[model samples]
Target: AFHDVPSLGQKVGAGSQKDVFHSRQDPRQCICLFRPGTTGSIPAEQYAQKELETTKQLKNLGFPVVDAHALVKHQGSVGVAKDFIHNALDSEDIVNNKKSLPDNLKFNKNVLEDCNAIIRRLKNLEVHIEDLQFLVDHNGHVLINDPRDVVRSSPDKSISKVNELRSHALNNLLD
Candidate 1:
C-alpha cells in the first residue's frame, strides 16, 4: 500500500541501494530500490524503467543475470523486481578476501571465463561498467547487477572503458 506497491514481502537485503524487498505477489523475486543521484540524474521512475528494460533484455538473451521482472514503488522510492538470489556475495568481496569469506570461492578460472563471456557480448550494445563486479552465488554461478543504463556508451571513447574494466577486474580483484 506504499503508493504503487500492492504488497511487499520481507526486506531481504540492501547495499548501494535504499532496500531490497521480496514481492508479495511473487516471493521468488526481489524489488531493488534506488535513490536518485545527488545531481543531474534521471528521475526515479524513469530510471527504474530504463534499468528494468535493460536487465530484462539481457536475461532474454540468455546471459547470466538475475531475472529482472517489473518496476514498483515503495516508501516513495522506485525499485525493480528481480529473481531473488539468496546466499550470494559479490566476486570482489570474495577476492578482497572478505572476513571468513569462505575458502572455496576459488572457482577463479570458471568465474573469469563467464565474466569474460558476458563482457564480450556487451560490446555489441556498446555498454560497459567501470568497475564491473559479478555476483557469485554459493553454488558458484557468476552474474552481474543490472538496470545500469547500459551507459557511458558510444564514446568512440566508449568501449575503452570495457577493455579497461575487464582487466581492471581480472587483474586487480582476482588476487
Candidate 2:
C-alpha cells in the first residue's frame, strides 16, 4: 500500500475502463484525478488504441482537445502517456486561457457576445455540447497516462450519423 492506496487497488470514480487512483509521488500535495482502467473492464491496449484514434480525429477538426504525449506498454498493458494541463474554465475565462482575445480581462457585453459567437461556431462545426454532465458518459472507455484530460468528440460515424446522434440527444431518445 502506498499512502492511502491499498497495495492491490483503489477506487477512483466514473472511468469508462480504468480504475482511478489518487496518490502523490510526493506526500506534500493532493491532486484530484481519474485513472481510467478500473471500471470499464477493457484491456489496457485496446483502451489506449481507442483514445488515440479519438484524439487524432478531434485534433484534425481543430477543436479544443488534450494532446496525447506517448503510448506506454507496461507489463503487457498499454496506455497513453500524456501530461495534464489545467483545462477547467468559466465561459468568460476561456478566451484568455486559449488566447483567442487580445483583452479578455475586460469583461463586457462585447466579451459576452464574443464568447457566444464562439459557442455558435462550435455548433456550426457540428459539435453540440449541450449536456456537459453527460459528455464524458458518451466517450466510451478510454484513458490517458499523461497528466491531463481527454478530449471531447462528436459522432465520427459520418455527417448524417452525427446528425442522427444529435437528433436523438435533443429528443431525449436513446441511440
| Candidate achieving the largest lDDT | 1
Q: What is the total number of backbone clashes in candidate 1? A: 2
Q: How high a TM-score does candidate 1 get? A: 0.67
Clashes of each: 2, 13
lDDT of 2 by residue, 95-123 (tens): 12332222222223333333233344455
Q: Name the 10 consecutive residues with the lowest summed lDDT in model 1.
A: 155-164
Please, what is the whole-model Cα lDDT of each candidate in the order they appear?
0.60, 0.34
Off by over 4 Å in 2: 1-41, 86-118, 127-175
